[PDB]
Amino acid sequence: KDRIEIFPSRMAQTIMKARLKGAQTGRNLLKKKSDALTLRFRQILKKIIETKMLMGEVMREAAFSLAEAKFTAGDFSTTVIQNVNKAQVKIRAKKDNVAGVTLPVFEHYHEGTDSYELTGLARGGEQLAKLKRNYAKAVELLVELASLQTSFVTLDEAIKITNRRVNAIEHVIIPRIERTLAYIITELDEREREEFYRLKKIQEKKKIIKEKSE
Amino acid sequence: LTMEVDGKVESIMKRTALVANTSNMPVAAREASIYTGITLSEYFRDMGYHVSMMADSTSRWAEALREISGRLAEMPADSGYPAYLGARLASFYERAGRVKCLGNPEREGSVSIVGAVSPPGGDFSDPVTSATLGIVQVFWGLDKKLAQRKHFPSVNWLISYSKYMRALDEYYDKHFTEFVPLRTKAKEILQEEEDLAEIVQLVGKASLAETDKITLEVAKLIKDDFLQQNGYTPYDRFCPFYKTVGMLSNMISFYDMARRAVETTAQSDNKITWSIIREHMGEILYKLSSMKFKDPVKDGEAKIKADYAQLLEDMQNAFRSLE
Amino acid sequence: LTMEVDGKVESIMKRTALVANTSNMPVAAREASIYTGITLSEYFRDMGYHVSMMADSTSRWAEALREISGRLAEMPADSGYPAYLGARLASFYERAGRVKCLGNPEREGSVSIVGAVSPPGGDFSDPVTSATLGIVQVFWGLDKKLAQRKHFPSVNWLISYSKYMRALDEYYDKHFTEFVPLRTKAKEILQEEEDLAEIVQLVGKASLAETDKITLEVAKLIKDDFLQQNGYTPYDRFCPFYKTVGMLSNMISFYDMARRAVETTAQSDNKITWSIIREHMGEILYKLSSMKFKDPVKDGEAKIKADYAQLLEDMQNAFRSLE
Amino acid sequence: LTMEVDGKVESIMKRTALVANTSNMPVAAREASIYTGITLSEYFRDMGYHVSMMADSTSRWAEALREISGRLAEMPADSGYPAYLGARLASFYERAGRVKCLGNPEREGSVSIVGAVSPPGGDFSDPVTSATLGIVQVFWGLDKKLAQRKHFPSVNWLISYSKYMRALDEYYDKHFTEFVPLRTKAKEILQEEEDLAEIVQLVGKASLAETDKITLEVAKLIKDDFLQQNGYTPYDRFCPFYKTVGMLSNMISFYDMARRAVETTAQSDNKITWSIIREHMGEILYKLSSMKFKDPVKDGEAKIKADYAQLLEDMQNAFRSLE
Amino acid sequence: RGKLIAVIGDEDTVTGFLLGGIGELNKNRHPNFLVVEKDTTINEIEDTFRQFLNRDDIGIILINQYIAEMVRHALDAHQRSIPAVLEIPSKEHPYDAAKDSILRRAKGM
Amino acid sequence: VCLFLNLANDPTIERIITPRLALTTAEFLAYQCEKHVLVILTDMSSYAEALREVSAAREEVPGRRGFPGYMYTDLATIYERAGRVEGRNGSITQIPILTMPNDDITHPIPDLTGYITEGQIYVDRQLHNRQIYPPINVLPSLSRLMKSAIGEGMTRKDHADVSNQLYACYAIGKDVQAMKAVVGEEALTSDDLLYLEFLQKFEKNFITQGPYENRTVYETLDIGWQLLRIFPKEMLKRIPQSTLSEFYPR
Numbered sequence A: 001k002d003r004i005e006i007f008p009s010r011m012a013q014t015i016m017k018a019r020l021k022g023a024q025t026g027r028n029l030l031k032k033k034s035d036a037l038t039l040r041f042r043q044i045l046k047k048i049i050e051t052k053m054l055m056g057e058v059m060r061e062a063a064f065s066l067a068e069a070k071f072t073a074g075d076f077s078t079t080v081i082q083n084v085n086k087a088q089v090k091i092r093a094k095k096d097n098v099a100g101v102t103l104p105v106f107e108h109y110h111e112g113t114d115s116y117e118l119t120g121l122a123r124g125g126e127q128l129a130k131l132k133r134n135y136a137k138a139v140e141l142l143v144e145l146a147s148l149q150t151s152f153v154t155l156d157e158a159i160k161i162t163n164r165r166v167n168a169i170e171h172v173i174i175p176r177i178e179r180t181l182a183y184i185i186t187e188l189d190e191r192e193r194e195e196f197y198r199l200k201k202i203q204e205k206k207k208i209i210k211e212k213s214e
Numbered sequence B, C, D: 001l002t003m004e005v006d007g008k009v010e011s012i013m014k015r016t017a018l019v020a021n022t023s024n025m026p027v028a029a030r031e032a033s034i035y036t037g038i039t040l041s042e043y044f045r046d047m048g049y050h051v052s053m054m055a056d057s058t059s060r061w062a063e064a065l066r067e068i069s070g071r072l073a074e075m076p077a078d079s080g081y082p083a084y085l086g087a088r089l090a091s092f093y094e095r096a097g098r099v100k101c102l103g104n105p106e107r108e109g110s111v112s113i114v115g116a117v118s119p120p121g122g123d124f125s126d127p128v129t130s131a132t133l134g135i136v137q138v139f140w141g142l143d144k145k146l147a148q149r150k151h152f153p154s155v156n157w158l159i160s161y162s163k164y165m166r167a168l169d170e171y172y173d174k175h176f177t178e179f180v181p182l183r184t185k186a187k188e189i190l191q192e193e194e195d196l197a198e199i200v201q202l203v204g205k206a207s208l209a210e211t212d213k214i215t216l217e218v219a220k221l222i223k224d225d226f227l228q229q230n231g232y233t234p235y236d237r238f239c240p241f242y243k244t245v246g247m248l249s250n251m252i253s254f255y256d257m258a259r260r261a262v263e264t265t266a267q268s269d270n271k272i273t274w275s276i277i278r279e280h281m282g283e284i285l286y287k288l289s290s291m292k293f294k295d296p297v298k299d300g301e302a303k304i305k306a307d308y309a310q311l312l313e314d315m316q317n318a319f320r321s322l323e
Numbered sequence E: 001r002g003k004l005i006a007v008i009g010d011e012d013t014v015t016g017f018l019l020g021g022i023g024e025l026n027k028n029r030h031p032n033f034l035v036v037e038k039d040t041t042i043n044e045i046e047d048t049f050r051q052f053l054n055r056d057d058i059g060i061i062l063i064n065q066y067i068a069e070m071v072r073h074a075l076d077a078h079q080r081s082i083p084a085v086l087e088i089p090s091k092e093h094p095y096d097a098a099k100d101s102i103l104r105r106a107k108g109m
Numbered sequence F: 001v002c003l004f005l006n007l008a009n010d011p012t013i014e015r016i017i018t019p020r021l022a023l024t025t026a027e028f029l030a031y032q033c034e035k036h037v038l039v040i041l042t043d044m045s046s047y048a049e050a051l052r053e054v055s056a057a058r059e060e061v062p063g064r065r066g067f068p069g070y071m072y073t074d075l076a077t078i079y080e081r082a083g084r085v086e087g088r089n090g091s092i093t094q095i096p097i098l099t100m101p102n103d104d105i106t107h108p109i110p111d112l113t114g115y116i117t118e119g120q121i122y123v124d125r126q127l128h129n130r131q132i133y134p135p136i137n138v139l140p141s142l143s144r145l146m147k148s149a150i151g152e153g154m155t156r157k158d159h160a161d162v163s164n165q166l167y168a169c170y171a172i173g174k175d176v177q178a179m180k181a182v183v184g185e186e187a188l189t190s191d192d193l194l195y196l197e198f199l200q201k202f203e204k205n206f207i208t209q210g211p212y213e214n215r216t217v218y219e220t221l222d223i224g225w226q227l228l229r230i231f232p233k234e235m236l237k238r239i240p241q242s243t244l245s246e247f248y249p250r
């Protein structure tokens, strides 16, 4: 509600001033954290746009290498799809840190369990080898893209949470403490006024009693 | 206004007795007004009647005492009031309890003192309000925010209290046997909603548990459609206790059914949530909301009870078909 | 300080008086300084003159008033100030105004009070500042932030205000017809720039529309080249109102014509952009920035008006060619 | 109570005197109690002795002064106390000091006053506490948080102070030469912990540097096992200053050496971290924690010093192995 | 233990990715790739995509732009980051920056 | 040095008349003997306590926060007995020292002292706890007439620029420390590391002095330039190039 409901007092005023300063400091630190997260988020966004543009060419080159492969090797797609066995390229999870937020990323890692060797032993040969290299390059691009997008989503969520924290503070908590401090100041003024009235009344009565004695 | 006695309508002014001393009428007369009112109430109590003395504002009586004290140049207590304001208020309120009236014919009168207070600036720390809370056994604190939202009666269900619940459970268990658990559950719902609202104000409803969402929504239903009561309508001007208990019973039964469904389906794949419940029961929720619109006079007590039972049956059937 | 009157550099003390007192002077002297100043100003007003009274800090006068109240042992009002601070401030500021001076020779003098106040730590909520703001009709809101940014004068042009615009509408319409729409457009431009300052953070400058860019880059023009003004230079230490309205008219004409071009080329494939406009008319923007450097003395009113008209002609020609 | 003097146990009453005054005894006697005690202390100081005086509550003395001032009908200062409360407190305290006692046989006595202040609800702006802080040279402030956590002594090392450190430099630089830098480093460490705890609980513990981790954990060690002393145990009833200085020396030596390791291995392949240090030498941390358990009564001074030297040697050996 | 890469695209793209070395058969012999032939429908693509997302070791998922447009609702519903979904071009349809599920979070672009 | 001592246990009326004795002597020495006098008044809070006692003895009702209503006039009477005068070569600089009760800058004594005086030198409990001497905080402190105090022929050409740049770099260093508390040391940029280094060396060489280390203002400015040479010429944006080209080198 409007007030914290701490009874007016000088001790209460000191407590509320300390709490207001602490809330402001926490708001500033969370704002700095949000600024760092947003800077990294926009950097990753620009990197994502650039990587998408570069994929626009790498994927095209790989697809054309495949088209050339089909020129010599023939219809090797069925053989490629049928002989799968075990993946030669796997991924390993990695951790990245931005402010206090951990950003998941991926590692491009090889197994070596090749299964398409000799695929163009007689006719494909060079074209299929080049195609393999081009699609390995494309996978190298897309693993970086995936790491960027994972970090991007995590940063988006963290930025939203931290901005929500900062807004909650500066729109709910700080106004509450400011209202409490204003009320405490008003009530202490009222106490001073009442004490002044009592002392003035006592002084008037003392003067009247002195006159009575005189 | 009229009340039926032995099948004949008789005006309530035939039993009401006003003691009017408006704000601009002499200030010193307010104390005399309060004392005359309480003396009349005691007189009619001594006959065997259960008088009810509505003190329109004891804050004005306290202010009159403060003015007279200032003229007398007395030494003030808190905020200028005299040092005997609390004693005066206690002595005036102590004239209320149900009594075994004097005299030879055994009787049983009463004088229920319902005394409004008017804290300056709405601050309940006011000396008058504090001294009154130190005496009165029921505290119906009203909230300016609720009043501004037009949430009348503006009683603040959190701070407000009554120290007669344990003394009235004897009567409840015999006349409205199914009401005390409903009251307890309603207060639990309201407190839980208060905690969840304190949490949500800073964090939002994204992380709320589904049962917490149901608590919030049933509490909103209870607030907007059970607690608040437009006193200037043909239906809500008077809410008999059969209505007061039936509405609460239906709302608490819906709460129990929703909570049971969600809790028992949390593990299963067909997770039932508040959104599913609301979409499936938009009609039943509206019927619960409009339960307050039943007219005690145009529609009989039997009709109102039958309609509430039918709404309960609709809730049960809808929940069964949902699960 | 010296002023040029009739071609001779006189001293402003030939027409100025200084009711100067420090903080160790008698409190009565400090508290009656304002009244002495306003009475002298009223005297010279009645003489038929226009007087400008300037209280350096009415906060210190109010402190002297509070000290007098404490010495007399009067009841402490809001935050310790006397029970009549608002009355005293209102009655003092009521003495400012334009009058038909008493006496036979038909005269008309005036007294303009420019009394300054000192808000505690930049807070306009203390009794003295609150009463002063309520009473006064203009607030020139100097800003240490702009002083640090080197934006002189440091008037914040966002918290400042003036309630005499409706009073001066007649004068402007008679003499400076276009100034009222020019000023309204400038104020709205500055408000839009303030609102877009937040959007720039959220999405950056690249996400701003062409209209937003034109608003931003004319708001910067007004801030740095119209509002900003150096009192030391010989050319714009004193800016005649004809020069001021000419500069504002040229700037707002640039803004309106650029906005028109952008809006009317939004429908075409060869849509214009603020970058295109800047690249084409870097000369015109330079001239708009250099409109300050016209010397009112050497470059007479006629010459400055002719040069600004030629500038507007050049802008119209360039915009017509581009469009 | 008994103490060991010249190899014998003798009652404390043989050198202690008590001036008792319960709260219900006359307020005049309550006011004169402090003066009687200080006069006895001054007499025994003139004797050539060092008299430690302990005033159970100067707050109750101030209450007595306030009540007597009211009975006399004097004008109070802030919070109802007489305006001479500070003067009376000074007249009492300043009677302390080390003095070349009067009388021909040369002697040097002293009176050391320890006055207790108990403000209303731990108020720091209490008039009596402010008057005291304006006079006393040492102030062992109270940490309500530490008291609630049961961290005894509950001294709040951030606002508590002692102005005798400068005068004690001569004593330390001749008997405990190494203690002053240890005290300086301990205070710096505690202040760094105070500054880091806010950031840790506002935002998180993940961004902390290794040096920050060293500071935090050494601060925890110092606070829990050097600043935390249970006065009811046989071993911690009284901690000799040789024990205090040796403990602080071990703790600060560990701090400096751990920070040296961390910083040196920073920007190097074989990086060292607080986690590595703790995992390696949890035994060393446990020994440093148990250092507070040494009992001077049975573990003589030589034994305690040798044990602490052995702990330092083990620390050095373990960090040499780490490096 | 490490995660895999999954593909949902035209036969040519799937063949190229397999040559890149992305496919494997697990203990239960489930492939981690799909060829979107004309005989395959939107419901089939949605089902296999949901299986891919549910699988905890999938890691990265790649989808052609047109397939992503076809099954766009599932892409938008998928909000968690770890199953890194990417939209890739194809010879059939070009890739466009607009209307990308990941880019839906961006207005400064 | 003319030393007037009023011990806490001496009469409070003597405490009242002590500052007037000191300032009468200062006026005699400055406006008649024509020598520049520095008046250091210690514990104006204790003086205010004596004033409160005298008011209560007069039987005047307490004013704001229990202090006399005219305390502003009294403090003005004390302070304003200072400054240069026309036709005399002496002056009276004043440095009243206050014990802000409860560290509350809104307390009447510090409030009216700020209203009457022309600056403030803050002694920080945080720096004191960190064991820096003098624990003078330079961010909240201020001296309105520093521009009149410094400059060519008074201290040196570069005093104002050096002071402004030192203040700016110190504020930026505190900000960078706060940011590092959240982002971590690695995430900081080279400029941030430079600012942290300058903060440390500024609190260890400029502020940290030692009780008996008398630095001439030229030594102070040389230390300031040593600290400013942490940064390259470009990041010293508040020092005009005319001054940087002359004092930055070496």
Ligand SMILES: Nc1ncnc2c1ncn2[C@@H]1O[C@H](COP(=O)(O)OP(=O)(O)O)[C@@H](O)[C@H]1O
Pocket (backbone or CB within 6 Å): B152, B153, B229, B230, B231, B232
């Ligand atoms: N039970 C109620 N139903 C509808 N409106 C109400 C009810 N109680 C109060 N109000 C509204 O609150 C307003 C104030 O009523 P009243 O109690 O007379 O003021 P006060 O609280 O100052 O005595 C009225 O104008 C009325 O419209």
